[PDB]
Amino acid sequence: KNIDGYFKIYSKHTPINLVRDLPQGFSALEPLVDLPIGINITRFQTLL
């Protein structure tokens, strides 16, 4: 997310036993980094 010129990243890594889909249970993501970079963002893309 972007707030007040900061770009924030949160994450989680978990083992799962399901190939098709997201697990129905609950788990909470924790902050990785909080970057002071100030850019406008309206689009994104993943790298493969």
Binding site: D4, G38, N40
Partner: peptide, 24 residues
């Protein structure tokens, strides 16, 4: 601070045009 001793010449290299935006 004023900087007329450092940054004047004129010194037209100095340019001008959301919070903390760097719109180049």
């Amino acid at each position: 601070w004023n900087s007329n001793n450092l940054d004047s010449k004129g010194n037209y290299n100095y340019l001008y045009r959301k919070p903390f935006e760097r719109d180049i």
